[model samples]
Target: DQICIGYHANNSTEQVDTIMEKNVTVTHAQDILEKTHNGKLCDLDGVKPLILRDCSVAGWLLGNPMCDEFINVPEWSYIVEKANPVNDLCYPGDFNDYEELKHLLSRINHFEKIQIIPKSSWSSHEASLGVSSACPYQGKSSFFRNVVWLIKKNSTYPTIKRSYNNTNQEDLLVLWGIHHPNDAAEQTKLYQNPTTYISVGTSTLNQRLVPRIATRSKVNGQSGRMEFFWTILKPNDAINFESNGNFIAPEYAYKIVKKGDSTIMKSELEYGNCNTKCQTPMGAINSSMPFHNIHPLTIGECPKYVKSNRLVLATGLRNSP
Candidate 1:
């Protein structure tokens, strides 16, 4: 029965059901392939859970990107690939450590034997960090990246299922989805600031198509700083324990069975200015023939073998701001 204000339709009454249970090979391999090529992406940023646009099946599959000004789309920041749950460990089918993997098994139980027959394909390669969308979008032009499938135990569905087969679990096929990798670089060198140019910049973009902008942190935006201090954490804020004793507050303690203090402060303090070239005041120098100094006024001179006799000196300062 369809509720008037809720589910707007029924099968026999309206011929519309969100997911109609069928006995045939109902994985709809051909339909899925066409949908893949036909669907437009919400390719706006390299955000997680890539989204779809102007599509219906996508509602439950890829979901919509919450309304943003620029018709917010997905970034070409990722590619789609298939994966089996890592089979390195002998995990029993009943041992559902992964929820999604568990759900796939359940879907396998309900759906009529699905034997996925190939149709079309696409993929993304490397979306190098800081580089534009061109970097990642280099290989593929596609969407609906979270690829999943289902089938009964004995059906000949081509796959690389990882869980150990048994009474409690259905044989899982495979999972195709998005994969993003770190592609950022680090900086170290310093350079002098360049003078500002005097010319007005030109814009070739359509000025009328400007998208609206929003700020979630307006107060902090205006002040350019954090608006509030960290609240005092009560003792119960963190998990506590006791062989028979208990604990809390700033000294929140919890037992990590095998991995105690899984922390490592192995700082290999990469060459800093102090350790490498060294950072210190630089001004007056030893005279080649006693040329007098200029009047921003050099306080001290650098002699060939000069060592300080005093503890401190009037600090180096002048108008920079």
Candidate 2:
């Protein structure tokens, strides 16, 4: 069985003092966790949790009005699950090919670098730029090419121009075979190898509605398996969210590798600071809003305002030539 399923995106934004001041301590990512009922944003060593997950709707998707109507939204049926079948051709090729394919699938299952575009960032018009660059399809269908869509601070996310591009935000993780042309012959031609076309969904789905589903396809039964991959549009700038949880000019990777060793020593490292000259507060260090908080906040708080606060596009857009 083949399936194309995704959850509705919920956009949120806020202008808390921590975000506005760019303080190292007050983590809005935590707020995102708390408000959205996600766990703590940061781990012990100042690493914030990347919000995108296999089941939950990425923060980017909720912003769109059509999200709830077209895609899966948080409801009675929880989004994430195991043994979830991915859609691709059932019959790939030979036994050896299937064995190698299984190994690659294992790697994807364990990978943790998954990222999602925050609803906040969608407002800047920069995202539209990435869409234009990665035009997977054209015309009306082009709308579905990038796959995910998100709404940031403003009610309406700006349409990206064909020219504007960035690296920091666009490194998309593209999944496959979940959604594609319906052609038994074409699919057969494409599925020369089991791993060749079977992908779950893309991280860059239109409005950020990446679908993680369970498919039951077979490449000669025993060789049957699931597939998933991530694709990013790549931002023009290297900088993204801070490792220490603040707005920093340099991306989180730069901070980790700054000493050139590319590893952080627990002994040598003390407290982290925001890129700006400021000290982070103690209580704010590792506190996230929590998973339970998200639903209540969704009901009590204004959806648009909360969504805006989380994304970075409200500030500005930068690109690499």
Candidate 3:
């Protein structure tokens, strides 16, 4: 089986089977340093017996960022280092009540084994609020800057407070996979205004790539005084997602769970790149059967259609043909 998938052709099938069995048993025994697969798949049945007794068992593990910081924990975020999840910029007080939540989660039988892993700083109230501001990327980066400034200015500072509105439960988690902190800063600030010049830009380039020789007109992309709402979410659509009993949206909640980390520096993908990919719907293409297994959902396949139908019936209205 392994050889078929591009591996060295080894001994006979019987020999390979025995060797594979031995290899599987030795794999888990490898130390933390060598272990790449960190139990994404586990035998839940093994813990079923223990959980049935209402035993308060927990399995807490560090996130990817924290895992790298095992040698020196300071390599992680300031919050994780100080054990204070107090995000001063957005979270004036105890933001998500992580301590209290953890304590409460500990008491719950099913959730006792709830593994809380350290994620992006966006997973904090401070970061989430910034993302929902006038200039989302700029605000988030500014908030991060404030955090650094405060830390450097006051070494012995007890705690700081943010001027933003309060959130009972919510946090932003920043995934550095696509873009790094610096990249976010550049994108937000540069694109914050369309009137701004591209040459005036620092690390990033907002300028016209190729100069046209014969072209008289040039396409100008700029954000003017007028505001235009553009997102996968429509204006009439309601933001949906469960939260910590608060009215916080899921997007906000997700942010607070995965925010800050300078572990791996990554650059932001350009607009042209994103546009090229969007033009091609890589995965599944045309859907012929509505009830097909591939089309997992059917109830609300066309929400706009259903809504229009209801409105027409209610007012005895018909389309002008």
Candidate 4:
């Protein structure tokens, strides 16, 4: 039963320094870890934990979550077991064809490199672009902690033209099914096989282009699995966090991508700093925030994390035209 679920998005903009400074260190994650479970990695918080998984609120809002890894923490094992019956969450995306996704990708003046980014690192990147995640107070909705909502630092997204015309659209990073990186068993099959249509977009969702998650495909070389793709809406001039609602401190709009470009050059017009955010959530397939902990989608044992302070939007060249 490939049941689909997600969690509520907890729009957070409190920490902008991590990305603006381009320094999401293991120390930061370690700090986040220390803030929980009686001060230790994967240790139980012993507070009865908020293990009630609810992906229903955001299942449709955050499209393409199938590419995220699941939680495998030592203490949170019960959360998974408890959520197993109700979660059953996992889903596919529209534009069901993989080749078509690549087709649109080629037309855009975007990046093609994909990399493995840990949650702490990925969160900072999102905060820099006027978008944010997690509760800020705590990690309730990994869906909230994870999904990149349309909300901005100013508490509202700017005027969206609201069109699904892919023809007129450009710039998008994607993901899909997981684990076994080098096994290379024609991973392509997963793209065609999805759990359900959790609704990335529906009648109520008003956006110019609804994001889609296509499974099974290799980008430049990496499995279309998990990667952070960013786009700086141009003038591409320096953003005024005071006005744009960008979460990146107040003086670092130019430092969006630290390692590769250290600059948000304007080759043309862009939007929402070019894109939104997403890290992952819940049961390998069924998950959201407040109740789940995410592990890397690796070949190693369950409950593992990888960190990165280095940069480059997974794969790209200064995001030029």
Candidate 5:
């Protein structure tokens, strides 16, 4: 009942041998041949042929032949699978070697801080500079309103001053004083070096406007003064009513100064005073007002203005050196 067969093994060994001589049963050899070659053995007439040579040891190929001493052969498949598969052979040898990959991953989830100021002393002021109107009219005046001051501690304050050239007003002081008191108890009252003081004032230009008023600064600490001057021409003042266009009034200024453990802030309405006749009489517009009585006036909210290129560029150039 023994049989003879011829075949090639995955190990490159080909031989023609008797199955009985090889100590393998016909059924056993046939099963081995089918499993290794992925097919059943062929039958020739009354004889059945079984081959073990074509047994596919391919799963064991491409493993570290040199490391076979650590363990051996077709068993390499088990070792390779449990360890590193053939596909993963080129990857870094160390299991923990992900430094580069980790760096890339870190960048994928990167975080950064937005710098508010490049340097501690650095400051920025942004405000509207000037307005453009369609037609040119005679006298222009700037009105001040809604003056607000929210002074924070440790902030730097700049000097703010303006002039009403047409009205012969020069160096009109909007803010000019600063003081830090030794007495924390009297910190709320007016002293020669007033720790804290609050005063209200107004500027006039047009209807209910030009209600002329002024005030002096009580700011302590002295470091010269910064000046910002601009002339705002209102709709009626800069252009004729027929043209019907108004100008963006430049009306506000802010400055901050810093001293030992304290910061001071000043907000002011600065503008030009031009002499012009209104299209409509003030009385006609304010007919509700008692002809003989004057309305009570208070500090208005500080109007907001844009930083002038002149001031900003000058500061930058001065600091450039």
Candidate 6:
């Protein structure tokens, strides 16, 4: 008698006939099984069950349910495949906040090709007020041989208060990055009142510790105002100081925080000016004279005094078009 056996192969799926006899062996049966199931051919029904289950193997794992969902969704895979990370400042990473990301970006050795607004156009109430009141003079004056003299020395002039108005947020955006050199209108503006674009060259953690050039003119490259050195302190470690003795002078330290899309910064500064023994009183009335006002001319000194003021400025950033 002859029996037919069903089998599948890469060539075709069909039936084969074999004679049933006492000599039928296990090896012949194995050969029949190999032909019955093609190794390359897969059934969708068999795989569909395994595809939708928790896929934990070895020590590796995807503990999140959403992660599995992401893989199941083909749209997400397509979206991820299309994102290219070229021509960007930095690659994406796990950042605690924007400030941390900013610091990390700042540490990079790339030069920021940017143009700055002219000192006249670039407005900073703090910068202007600081320079104007850089120094203060006090005391009274009188005539001595056609020269003014300070009498009693205790006589003083009215003083001007040194206070800083917070910088305008709009202006701050321009200072950071406003118009690029490529824009024709902006280029024309720069040409009419021209200032060259400068690079933020090679800033490092160590270099940031000392005062650096903040702004300058293109005509004369080297001379401009110096910005106070930046000192980085841990978010919680930045503390306030009391009494002028312990305060940092000439330079201020600042910290930044992330608020929405903007970066907020807080700064502390000490400011004041004083002049003493400014002039040697070469000619002054002495007690020997009969008249108290008409004494012998004697040498004396003029004194000036100024009390230091503490200034604090808070401002944030805005994106420029």
- The C-alpha RMSD of each candidate to the native structure, in angstroms, is 39.7, 27.3, 27.5, 28.6, 42.4, 37.4
Whole-structure CA lDDT of model 1: 0.18
List the global CA lDDT of all models: 0.18, 0.24, 0.19, 0.24, 0.19, 0.19
Between the candidate structures 2 and 4, which one is better when assessed by TM-score?
A: 2
lDDT of 5 by residue, 1-321 (tens): 899995432321222234354321121121111001111112212122111121111111111122222212211000011122232211111212233422322222111111111222212222221111211113321111111111222332222222222221221212111222224332222121222232222344322111111232322222111111122222222211110011112222111111111101111111112221110111101122112111111111111222221110011111110
**1-321: candidate 1 lDDT, tens digit per residue:** 775663222222111112353222211111111000111221112222111222221111221111121122322121111132121111011111233432322222121112221222101111111112111222432222222111112222122212111121232222121111111111001001111111111121111111112232323112111110011112222211111000000111111112111111111122111111111112123233223222221222322222322212112221121
lDDT, model 2, position 48: 26
How far residue 209's Cα lies from its native spot in candidate 3, in Å, is 37
TM-score of 6: 0.16
lDDT of 1 at 237: 29
Q: Poorest 10 consecutive residues of model 2 by lDDT?
A: 245-254
Candidate 2 per-residue C-alpha lDDT over 124-147 given as tens digits, one digit per residue, 9 for 90 to 100: 422232222112232312122213
Count backbone clashes in candidate 2.
69
Q: Model 2 Cα displacement at 177 (Å)?
A: 5.8
Tens-digit lDDT track for model 6 on 150-190?
Answer: 11112222111111222323111111111123233433332
RMSD of candidate 5 to true structure, Å: 42.4
Candidate 4 overall lDDT versus native:
0.24
Question: Between prediction 3 and prediction 4, which has the larger TM-score?
Answer: 4
Q: Specify the poorest-scoring 10-residue window by lDDT in model 3.
A: 50-59
Highest TM-score among the candidates is held by which one? 2
lDDT of 4 by residue, 41-154 (tens): 121222111122332212211221321222211121112112222222222122224335333322332232222223333231333331212222133223222333222323
Candidate 3's residue-wise lDDT over 218-241, tens digit each?
111211111011112212222222
- Candidate 1 local Cα displacement, residue 168, angstroms: 27
Off by over 4 Å in 4: 1-139, 144-147, 159-321
